[model samples]
Target: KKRFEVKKWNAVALWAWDIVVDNCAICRNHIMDLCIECQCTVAWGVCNHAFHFHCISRWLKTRQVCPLDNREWEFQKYGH
Candidate 1:
């Protein structure tokens, strides 16, 4: 098994809530509702983890790695 480098979602600060989702680790956005906007499911991949485009994109600016498990994806939108 891969020793995943996980970076569990944690708000940068209490005030961060005003800027992003409260909790996505267990957000109930539904299987069909899962998307980058929900911040509770990935826009792609079979992985159950989700994240907001803005949140992860900004994070990617600093590090090219997934926040949840350091899983790398060829970041893109609609078309690759």
Candidate 2:
């Protein structure tokens, strides 16, 4: 047997993004819990860019663009 003292213990844990990245190209915030004025919904483009809805919608008003690539704006999917 090994000489080991059991004093106290607690579980340690962590988590990660359920999808693509920990950061958004648009806001550079983690791409979930979706913030910056307490925003909602994530916009996924055919270009595969993940920009939150509020920011992207505002950007679109200026120009039809992916922002990440400055290419033609098109929606690939919508998610939260």
Candidate 3:
């Protein structure tokens, strides 16, 4: 027979609402971080998806679809 002692355990659970997107899909950088081109904020699409303002603007210049979902990217709401 053998006995072992448990030291420590840590766990993290992320809910859909609690999961804050911290990186931009287009730039692959922190969304809150200022971009080299200009300052940016969070922009949401009708698809309920979020992206960095400048990142999405630059992306939308050529393509007008959600990078994540590939749906028509229409601004439903926006915030920082």
Candidate 4:
């Protein structure tokens, strides 16, 4: 028995990464989230990757490269 009729269905999808909140390459937490060590400051390297201010400093102390991109680290900016 057919009690209902369907004609058509449609949907749309979208994506974005540019100029948006970034996730830390370490920790896998969003850059805006509280750091595993302390307050949620942030770092932006010339590679344009983001990290928890404390995470990368400590990270660099051990290995001096963008963990994700494997590029020499350069402090390009800082933001809350």
lDDT for each candidate structure: 0.43, 0.72, 0.69, 0.75
Minimal lDDT window, size 10, model 1? 13-22
lDDT of 1 by residue, 5-77 (tens): 8778775742221213434432333333544543432343223344444444556567765555556744533
Considering every candidate listed, which one attains the maximal TM-score?
4
Tell me, by lDDT, which candidate is best.
4
Cα lDDT tens digits, model 4, 1-80, are 99998889897874422433466777666778877787457888888776888888887788888887778999977884
List model 2 lDDT by residue over 1-80, tens digit each: 96998889998884423344657766777777675767488888766777788778877787897776767888877884
Off by over 4 Å in 2: 1-21
Question: How does each model score on TM-score?
Answer: 0.35, 0.62, 0.62, 0.65
Clash counts for the predictions, in order: 1, 0, 0, 0
TM-score of 1: 0.35
Predict model 3's lDDT versus the native: 0.69
What's the CA RMSD for each of the models?
15.4, 8.7, 7.1, 8.0
Which has the better TM-score: candidate 3, or candidate 4? Answer: 4
Model 2 TM-score, 2 decimals: 0.62
What is the full ranking by lDDT, best candidate first?
4, 2, 3, 1
TM-score of structure candidate 4:
0.65
